[PDB]
């Protein structure tokens, strides 16, 4: 459901 | 939120989303109380019956949001957690008494039009406002229709929802349930006759119940969304963590670290 968030946050 | 409406933009700039990294999920609501501190419900992190026990690296915090599922590219801020603090007497065995937790952010958030902390009440603010009949306001991205028993119709919102609900008197709170109610809780919601409806629901827990002071025009957080029996069931009510009664614990922890 969620749009992807920036990889710097994972 | 059941029977609420869409929030205006910037209407609740202290609302935070608790977001699981993997799988990517909404966990719970929360709130921003300074540049570095987030307030939520302990049951969002730690709940043994359901084998829930999150640590800091399990989670992200997302601040500044409106859309539930969009990444709001130059509007939202995402933060990492440094440290989770749960009340040492939170009662997950019995009734969710002391359902409160503090989260320390890795780096302070910058405020903006969409990111702005709420106040915590003082004694006289708690006293004047926390009265049966007065309404406060609950916000969140949780379900639109009951899932304590899964409900259809619409399911999930796309934007932040809002609802205003009256404080109910303590004897009616206690007579609505078989759970032992403590002085660290209050309940809220319309009575079955009153015609109006509305409630929190799954995915809303941990977020803010706020009220606006008529003396200084500021918003205060008086409750945290804690538990309830179903969502918007007639003759049942939402229960909230009583934020003022746990305020000593809150300031004890934010004073001991520490700059």
């Amino acid at each position: 459901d969620f749009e992807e968030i920036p990889e710097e946050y994972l | 939120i059941v029977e609420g409406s869409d929030a205006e933009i910037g209407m609740s700039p202290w609302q935070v989303m608790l977001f699981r990294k993997s799988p990517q999920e909404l966990l719970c609501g929360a709130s921003l109380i300074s540049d570095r501190w987030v307030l939520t419900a302990a049951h969002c992190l730690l709940y043994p019956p359901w084998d829930k026990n999150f640590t800091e690296n399990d989670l992200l915090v997302r601040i500044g949001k409106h859309s539930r599922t969009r990444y709001e590219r130059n509007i939202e801020k995402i933060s990492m957690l440094e440290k989770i603090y749960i009340h040492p007497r939170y009662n997950w065995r019995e009734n969710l008494d002391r359902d409160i937790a503090l989260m320390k952010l890795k780096k302070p958030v910058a405020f903006s039009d969409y990111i702005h902390p709420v106040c915590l009440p003082d004694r006289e603010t708690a006293a004047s406002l926390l009265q049966a009949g007065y309404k406060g306001r609950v916000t969140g991205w949780g379900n639109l229709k009951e899932t304590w028993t899964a409900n259809v119709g619409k399911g999930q919102p796309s934007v932040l929802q809002v609802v205003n609900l009256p404080i109910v008197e303590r004897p009616v709170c206690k007579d609505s349930t078989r759970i032992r109610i403590t002085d660290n809780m209050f309940c809220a919601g319309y009575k079955p006759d009153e015609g109006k409806r509305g409630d929190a629901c799954e995915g809303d827990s941990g977020g803010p119940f706020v009220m606006k002071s008529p003396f200084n025009n500021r918003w205060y957080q008086m409750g945290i969304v804690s538990w309830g029996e179903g969502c918007d069931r007639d003759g049942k009510y939402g229960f909230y963590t009583h934020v003022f009664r746990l305020k000593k614990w809150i300031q004890k922890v934010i004073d001991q670290f520490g700059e």
């Binding site: - | 902390p117 309404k135 008529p214």
Partner: protein
């Protein structure tokens, strides 16, 4: 001090700070014995 730092708490940039009301906050304020 002055709150937790802020001090500015609870006053929203897009509303209180520029003297705009949201579309339901009057419902809150008139439940407070109405009071005015």
């Amino acid at each position: 001090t002055f709150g937790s730092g802020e001090a500015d708490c609870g006053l929203r940039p897009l509303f209180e700070k520029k003297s705009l009301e949201d579309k339901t906050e009057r419902e809150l304020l008139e439940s407070y014995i109405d009071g005015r």
